[PDB]
């Protein structure tokens, strides 16, 4: 399988096993969902009837008053009472099988080729750490919303991209599945494709 480079006008061979396989929507879904769930902070709590501030004094006697029997002013039935099933902080992280994670990456990359969204180049850098330069390079290469996967993360291109909200710049080790799907076009350097191939096998 051959990915053509638009910058130098050539070809680059890649494994059919990584860029060729059909799109397992179900498997990608499980992995995209697991990624979102892994981003959750899960930091909250309410107060049970145990934790609300007040005494354990029975508000009135069990019998004779003509009122509904009461036991605690903290009863969740009462205004100002405990929350019946008060939240505690939760870990929302899911386990994703290594093979299912790698499976999903292969499905997503294979789709990024079929929808002409994986734009492979040979060399992608800027001269100085200047946002004006990368903005200019991106309008010439003719894309706005883009994920730029490079071999080794160049400090200058990192800094240039930082203040362009549509543009993200990562090393091949840093590809997540949500970012591969979220961005309109993915610009991979030939060097990076080699690493992503080696990484997924």
């Amino acid at each position: 399988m051959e990915l053509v480079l638009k910058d130098a006008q050539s070809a680059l061979t890649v494994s059919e096993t990584t860029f060729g396989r059909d799109f397992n929507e179900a498997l990608v879904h499980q992995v995209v969902v697991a990624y979102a769930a892994g981003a959750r902070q899960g930091t909250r709590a309410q107060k049970t009837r145990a934790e609300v501030t007040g005494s354990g004094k029975k508000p009135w006697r069990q019998k004779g008053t003509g009122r509904a029997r009461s036991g605690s002013i903290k009863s969740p039935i009462w205004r100002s009472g405990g929350v019946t099933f008060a939240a505690r902080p939760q870990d929302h992280s899911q386990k994703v099988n290594k093979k299912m994670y790698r499976g999903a990456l292969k499905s997503i990359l294979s789709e990024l080729v079929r929808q002409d969204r994986l734009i492979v180049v040979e060399k992608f850098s800027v001269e100085a750490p200047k946002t004006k330069l990368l903005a200019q390079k991106l309008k010439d290469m003719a894309l706005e919303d883009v994920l730029i996967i490079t071999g080794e993360l160049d400090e200058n291109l990192f800094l240039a991209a930082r203040n362009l909200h549509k543009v993200d710049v990562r090393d091949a080790t840093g590809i997540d599945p949500v970012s591969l799907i979220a961005f309109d076009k993915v610009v991979m350097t030939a060097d990076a494709v080699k690493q992503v191939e080696e990484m997924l096998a």
Binding site: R61, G64, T65, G66, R67
Partner: peptide, 19 residues
């Protein structure tokens, strides 16, 4: 809402004893 109920107050008549 309802006011907190009163403690027992004096009763005018005894409850009739069915026994």
């Amino acid at each position: 809402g309802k006011p907190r109920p009163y403690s027992p107050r004096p009763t005018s008549h005894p409850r009739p004893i069915r026994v």
